[PDB]
């Protein structure tokens, strides 16, 4: 359970993302793919991309980055009351895309990394704490759905 002040921190951070959703989404996906190349293999859409330059030049990668972070922003603005929004993503990611929960942990770390990189000296220690809690909540609630469907624990 995040506090109100922690939710406020999270959504203040998210306001930085919303000023350039495509830019953040692209930087997150590239950080993920390059830090954890197994992740790229899950995207039949993107696995042709070999180099960071090709990733950066991919307009379609940007487009998908918008789709993904738009969904995450909507979830965060629910301040934990996200059952309806989280259900479809759980089902797709477990059963269709076949994304292990561990990869969602890597995704969370890529988000944090990119926030520091884009906003140096402006992503406060309080805000990092709050964002961690928000993301941990999202992974806990997705993981329960995966467990239900026979995918994790």
Closest residue to bound ligand HEM by CB:
92
- DSSP assignment string, 119-147: STT-S-HHHHHHHHHHHHHHHHHHHHHHH
Q: Identify which range of 6-14, 35-43, 51-59, 122-130 contacts ligand HEM by CB under 6 A.
A: 35-43
Q: Are 21 and 69 in contact (CB under 8 A)?
A: yes
Q: Which CB sits closer to ligand O=N[O-], 113 or 119?
A: 113
Is 97 marked within a binding site?
Answer: no
Is 113 marked within a binding site?
Answer: no
85 touching ligand O=N[O-], by CB under 6 A = no
Kindly report the length of the chain: 153
Give the Cα separation of 42 and 49 in Å (integer): 12
Contact with ligand HEM (CB under 6 A) among 71, 77, 112, 132: 71
Numbered residues of the known binding site for O2: 64
């Amino acid at each position: 359970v995040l506090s109100e002040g922690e939710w406020q921190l999270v959504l203040h951070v998210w306001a930085k993302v919303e000023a350039d959703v495509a830019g953040h989404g692209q930087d997150i996906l590239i950080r993920l793919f390059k830090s954890h190349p197994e992740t790229l293999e899950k995207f039949d859409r993107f696995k042709h991309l070999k180099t960071e330059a090709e990733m950066k030049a991919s307009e379609d990668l940007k487009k998908h980055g918008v789709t993904a972070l738009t969904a995450l922003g909507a979830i965060l603005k629910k301040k934990g009351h996200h059952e309806a929004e989280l259900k479809p993503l759980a089902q797709s990611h477990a059963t269709k895309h076949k994304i292990p929960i561990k990869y969602l942990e890597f995704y969370s770390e890529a988000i944090i990394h990119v926030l520091h990189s884009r906003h140096p000296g402006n992503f406060g220690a309080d805000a990092q704490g709050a964002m961690n809690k928000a993301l941990e909540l999202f992974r806990k609630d997705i993981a329960a759905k995966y467990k239900e469907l026979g995918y994790q624990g």
